[PDB]
Structure formats: structure tokens, C-alpha cells
Design a protein around this nucleic acid. Sequence first.
RNA 1: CCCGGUGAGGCGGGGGGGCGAGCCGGGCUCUCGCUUCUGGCGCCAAGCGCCCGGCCGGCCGGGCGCGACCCGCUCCGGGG
RNA 2: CGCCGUUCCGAAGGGACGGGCGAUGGCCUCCGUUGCCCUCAGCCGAUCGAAAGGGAGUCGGGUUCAGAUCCCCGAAUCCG
Lengths: 118, 57, 67, 233, 102
Amino acid sequence: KIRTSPTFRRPKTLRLRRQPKYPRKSAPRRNKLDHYAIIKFPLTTESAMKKIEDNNTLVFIVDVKANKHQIKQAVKKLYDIDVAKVNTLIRPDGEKKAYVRLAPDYDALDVANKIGII
Amino acid sequence: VRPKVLMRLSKTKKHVSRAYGGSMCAKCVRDRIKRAFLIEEQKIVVKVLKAQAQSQK
Amino acid sequence: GAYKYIQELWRKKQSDVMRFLLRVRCWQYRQLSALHRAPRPTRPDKARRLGYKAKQGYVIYRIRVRR
Amino acid sequence: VVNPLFEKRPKNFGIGQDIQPKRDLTRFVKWPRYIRLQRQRAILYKRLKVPPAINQFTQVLDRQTATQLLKLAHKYRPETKQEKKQRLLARAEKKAAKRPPVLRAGVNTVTTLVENKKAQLVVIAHDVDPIELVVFLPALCRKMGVPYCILKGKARLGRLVHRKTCTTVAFTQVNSEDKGALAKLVEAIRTNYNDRYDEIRRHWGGNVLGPKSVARIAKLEKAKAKELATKLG
Amino acid sequence: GRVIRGQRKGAGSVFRAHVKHRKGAARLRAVDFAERHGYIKGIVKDIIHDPGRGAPLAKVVFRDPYRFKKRTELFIAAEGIHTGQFVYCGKKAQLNIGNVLP
RNA sequence: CCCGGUGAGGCGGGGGGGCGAGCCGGGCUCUCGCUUCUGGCGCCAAGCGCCCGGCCGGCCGGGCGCGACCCGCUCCGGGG
RNA sequence: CGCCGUUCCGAAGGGACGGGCGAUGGCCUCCGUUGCCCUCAGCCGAUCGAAAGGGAGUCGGGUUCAGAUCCCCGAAUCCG
Ligand SMILES: [Mg+2]
Ligand SMILES: [Mg+2]
């Protein structure tokens, strides 16, 4: 009716949500970072054995794109174990190493036997 | 304390139990209470004189 | 036969009628941006004899070039 | 009985004093460029000198005449698409076992009719843009002796022919039951447009300053005429 | 020959103003209804030093006549003004040092 | 066409009101538009009028108008 | 090819307390969500720009061939 400000502003107008006639992609893309992809193989070095025996920690080489949440979910699902925390460093050769500490009720040396590490 | 530390302090530590407390010093709050009251009184006085001269006019 | 009169009318650019229309329209064109979508041909007779047709898929643009 | 707690608390809106009220500022708004451009084009037409060939289109039918003219024309509207399909289907039924009069739309159709003297009344919209499409038509209709009138709205002529817009329409024939209605229109229209043509084409438009300027001129003259009046006292 | 120093000054580059620590542009109030028909009151909050300028600047605060706001203006300090002083601007301010009149 | 300012915020004209003047209570030359003592406060309406609704003339809740004059063609100024 | 320009010729806000309407839900009691409408909104310049500027919050003991305020033991803390 009346303008109590000297400024004109673009009036707000309806914005409809997208309703595609067809999907631009026939099917969704397959998850290429599944549990099997995340965990490459276990590390069996001398420093890795020490972690198993003394820190209740498993030492895995993982995909460089994995994060600590995904690694934890992968280790639990693959081996039906529990994880206390996951530490990660990217090695000078470009591989990501995961220091997976298991829950206190899980014996890492026992679990390593299941995984075949030892 | 540093400004972001003020977020985790209770309110009692960041102010004073008085009008403007934590924002204006007591000395200047005294001056404002008088200044507000005394100027408002002056308005009434001039209003009566202005009204009187209007009556006398 | 209206397109004939318009063609002949636009040949009298120094007439009083045309001078008024060119003057005001140049003023209006000068208040817009250098490239400007136009809603319809300013000159329906001239546009069509240059190949334009009044159907979807033909669009008009007004361009301002420095002299 | 009134509650004594209620009282007047008037605001003093003088310079200084209280903040100003949110009064109507429509006159001082900064409007979008396109609003300024279309408004400034309306003042230029008033401000400048509009040649008679264009200015004539400002003279238009009064509302009473246009309503009668549009009521009569509404009896001769061209058939819609939906009902032309019906006529063809009925023509098939009539086949398996005269053209009524109608309006004529468009400056191209109407111009050719006017040159052939096949039009009895031509109606021209007053706001065709570009004006070249019709700026010549009034001068043509007078030359051929066709009565013509200028009506408000190329969109009101649009509603006649079921289109957004129409530059001009023309009566070529009417049913015998309407000849009297057309006859009265033609006689009223002709005296306003065809007969005054000598004066229409010598009548420029615009050339009117703005109210602030006019008031400034008047106030200056009002200082001399008063000075003149007090010359004798 | 090569471009002389005077020519090189107009290109900016190393010849632009040292405005890192300048307090702002010094201006009067934008003229509005209050100054056109009456006057408006302000208060000198501080008189400050502006780098690169000999004259001090005054920081005068007004009320916004249409909004609940305080307007901070940066004036050129007239000699003799002081903090806490009242200055007035408009067609009907009095003739006193620091006032702003047509 | 150009320049300046603004968050383009009260511009032009008229109405309405006030102090003065002076022609014989009214008209008009003609003026003004409510802030100058103090380093306070100051918005998101009070009030008045008119209608509407809900529950049971009483309670509860809305809308509108004045308050905040009317009409105007360039935002207001400066050039041109 | 592009350059200038950074608020300058721009309809530059996609936000919200609250109020009114519907549609949906669930620990269907009443609360949420969602869509529309009413109302309110300066910021006025996208974005980038510092491993020495600004910037919440971790310390002690042990431990390796090579890593530790990062691992282990212990005791804290900030933010959400
Ligand atoms: Mg305290
Ligand atoms: Mg840094």
C-alpha cells in the first residue's frame, strides 16, 4: 500500500523444486570404498608386532582416502572385533597406516591369529 | 581474561550488581542519574514559564 | 499493404514524424545496457525482409557500438 | 469509570525531539532502472513537441462511445478455434447426408480493405508501439472516406479477436438487424475524426513544462502583475 | 630518453598515498531535512590525530532523526572545540565556533 | 548531456494553525513550523473515533481511520 | 583472446522472533515437521590473502634402532 523505506528490493518469488522427467544417471554409482577396499593388508614388521603384544594395537595398511570413522567401521565388520581408537599416518611412500587399538576385552595377539598375521 | 574466555564464565563474574554493572563505572552512573533527573526538572520549569508567558500573552 | 507504407515511411528520416521517433528512441536505447534482448523487432517491416519470421526460434537483440 | 492509569503520551515530531514516523515515502523511492525509464519516457512525451501525426492518437473515444462501439463489435467476433472445429464437424454431417459478417483484424488486412473501400468503419488502438504500424492509417482512412475512430487499448481489441493484442479492426458488413446501430456510430465517429482532419493534422502535442517549472513561472509573473497593480494602487 | 620521475608519479605503484593508519575521510554531515529547515545537535566525543594531516579531527556524534541510532561523523576540528562540547548544524544554528551553518 | 549527495527520507503548490502589522469583528501586506544550560534518555504508539469476531451487558481477541493535512510529472540539489 | 573496475550506471536479502492459515506425522496425550500468507531485517559488497599478525582448549612420568605435549600410565581441559 505504502512504502516506508526509500529502497526498492527484489520481491521474493516462488522457487519450485526440481522435478526431472528422467534421471540424468540410469543407476547410482557403486560404493568403491567398501569395507574390503578400505583394508589392504596387515603390517607384519617388527614395530608392528610390538604394538600387537604391548599396546593391544593392530597395524593395517589402508586406502589413503579412508578416514578414521570408515576404518573403525571396516575393522569391526571384517573381523567382528571392537575398536578403542584409530590413529593414522600417511607413510613416506604414500600408503596410509592405521594403528587400530582394540577394546580391552579383545586380545590383539589372539585376534592376529584369527587374521593370520601371526 | 581474554575475550573468548568470557563465554565459559558465569554471569556473576562478568558484571556488577548495579545498573549498567560491568559496563559503566559507578562514578559516572551517579552523574547520569543526577544529570537525567536534573535536566528533566529543568524542562518542567521552562515548560511552566513558557506556559505562563503564553497565559500572560 | 501496411508493410509498404511503413517501408516508405522509414525513408523519410528527416520528416517531423521520424525525427521525433528516432530522437526519443535513441534516448531510450541509451539508458539500457550495450547488449539487450529485445521483445519484438523495432522495425517489423525491415526485419522480415531480411529473413525474419514471427515464429518461435527467432529472437531479436539490440547492440550499442561506439561510433 | 475510566481507569486513571491510562493517559496520553503524545510524540513531538519537530526537528530534534522524537524519531520521525514511518510516513509514506513513495515519492522518494529509488526505483529500479526499468521503472525510471518507463516513467521518464512519459514525461518526455509531455515535455517535448509531439508532431500531429503521432499526437492525433491521444484523441480517443469517450467511454460511452467506446462501450457502445465495443458492444456492437462483440456481435461480430471471429470464431474461436474450439468452435471452428465444431463448424467443420457439422459441415461433415451436412455433407454425409452463407458466410455471416465478421470483423477483420490486423493492420495488413485492414489497410488493404481501406484502400479497396470495402471497410465501413475502422477502429485503431491508441497505443500501438512502434507507432509506424498505424501512424499513417488515420490519414489513409480520411483519403478513402472511410469513417475511423481511435479507441483506448490494443488489448481491448485483443479481447475481441481472442488474441493478446490487435492493432486495428474493421467493419466490412453487418447483419440487417444491426445496420441502425452502425449508422449511429458512423455518424458520431465521422464528425469527431474524418471531418476535423484538417485541424487534427495541424495540432501538435506536448510542449508542457513541469509543475515545479510552471509554478516558478507563475510566481514570477504574479510578482509583476502585483507590481503592475500597485503601480496605480 | 626514459620516462622521468614526474611522469612515473601518475601511475600509482610506489607513488600512492600512505593511508594505512588514516582515521577516515573528514566531511560535514550529508545535508538532510534537519539542516535544511532547522538544526541538529551533536556532541564532541574525541579530538584525534590523523596521520599525514596537520589538523586534528573531531569525532562528533548525532542522533539519526529517522532511526534509533547514533551517527558518528568525522569533522575537521575547529580551533577551540573540546570534548563534551555541543555543536549544532543547520539553517538555524547559532553563530558559535564549531557550529555548521549555511 | 554533465556534476554532487543520500540507506535516493519530508521537494513544488495549496490547505490548516501561531506572533506581529494595519483598513473600516472580519479581511490582508507577510512571517514562522514547536529541539541552545548540563559529556542523561529518546525506535518497535499512547490517546480518540468507527466496525468485526469468540465465550458467557460482562470477559477475550481482531481490523480500520486520525494521531502523521491534501494534490502533484522528473529523488533532492548544481550546471546546461 | 579479453581488459578496466570493487561499490562504481544493480530489482544485489532466500533469512527470522512472532502471528494467521492449511497438509502431514510421532513418546498421536499434545507436541514437531512441512507448504502458504502476514509481519520484521542496513550493512553496502562474491571470493582469495599470513606454518612469525588475530585465533577456545594438555600437562607430568615412562617407553624406541629410529616417533612421541601425538604411543602407553596418570591427571586435566575446550568446543559441540
Ligand atoms: Mg561480578
Ligand atoms: Mg596463522
